[PDB]
Structure 1
Amino acid sequence: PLVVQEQGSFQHILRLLNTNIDGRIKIMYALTKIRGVGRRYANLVCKKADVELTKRAGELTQEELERIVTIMQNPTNYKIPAWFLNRQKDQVDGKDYHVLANNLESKLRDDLERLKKIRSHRGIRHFWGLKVRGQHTKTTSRGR
């Protein structure tokens, strides 16, 4: 509840899940740099890890940093609701998952060929690079 000082404990650059995080960002919004971690998700893992949101990224100790990456990789074990997850009711094993920085584009990709392998209409328009959700195309999306 007052200004405090520290020396040598701040860490300017963090590395979490093979992603570089700026250490002078507030912890809740620093994790949003990790792809697959939005503002809504980052708010809860810090609250489940008892990391008060009033701390910058470099303020955290190693003990706290490992406690966060553990929760993100195992969300359901920490009373994180299934509906709150990124990839729930998975295609192959049917369980609720939350894919992260490097895993996200791999399983996002696997969904694309899975649409394209069966040659569905939605997968085809994805192949063409067009809008797949029915949006009009006669007058919008003319950039490159």
Structure 2
Amino acid sequence: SLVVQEQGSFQHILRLLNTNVDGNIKIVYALTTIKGVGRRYSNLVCKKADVDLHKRAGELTQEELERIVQIMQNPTHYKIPAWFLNRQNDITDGKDYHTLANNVESKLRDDLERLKKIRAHRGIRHFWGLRVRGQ
């Protein structure tokens, strides 16, 4: 479109939010490249920031994300989706964990720690699924 180039600015791979939220995939699906964030979390940001999926995306500014830090940084007041998430209002804790790469799998398997120490299904056989199926 605009026949204008720039001076060393655009990259191709980023390192964002402690892992690789890349500079070729957007906010949305490079938060899917790291495990824990789906589509409509940052697509409800489209009705407040107008940033959809249609670009090669080494373009993001860290001050638009600060009005998304108005949506992110405290997980108790900031429009967390409630029919959406990976694990969400859990048996594990009870809150709607729209968490991140370092915080999904630590908040995922308290349903598999449980049931046949309790003599039923998931407290020896999932430990057998860790003493055998893990090595």
Q: Which runs of 4+ in 1 moved over 6 A?
A: none
- 1:32 touches 1:42 (CA, 8 Å); kept in 2? no
What percent identity do the matched residue pairs reach? 77
**1:113-124 map, 5 Å:** 113-115=113-115, 117-124=117-124
Taking the aligned partners of 1:14 and 1:35, their CA distance within structure 2 comes to 16
Match of 1:36 in 2: 36
Taking the aligned partners of 2:103 and 2:65, their CA distance within structure 1 comes to 20
Match of 1:133 in 2: none
- The alignment covers a number of residue pairs equal to 129
Compare the two structures and name the one with the higher strand fraction: 1
Q: Which runs of 5+ in 2 are unaligned?
A: 130-134
Taking the aligned partners of 1:73 and 1:86, their CA distance within structure 2 comes to 19
Match of 1:107 in 2: 107
Match of 1:95 in 2: 95
Match of 1:136 in 2: none
- 1:88 touches 1:96 (CA, 8 Å); kept in 2? yes
Q: Which runs of 5+ in 1 are unaligned?
A: 130-143
CA offsets per residue over residues 77-131 of structure 1, 9 Å max, x none? 45443112232223365333322211111112444324465343144443333xx
- 1:19 touches 1:34 (CA, 8 Å); kept in 2? yes
Q: Are 2:51 and 1:52 equivalent residues in the alignment?
A: yes
Match of 1:19 in 2: 19
Aligned-residue RMSD, C-alpha: 3.5
Match of 1:61 in 2: 61
Distance verdict in 2 for CA 1:50–1:103, change over 3 Å: same
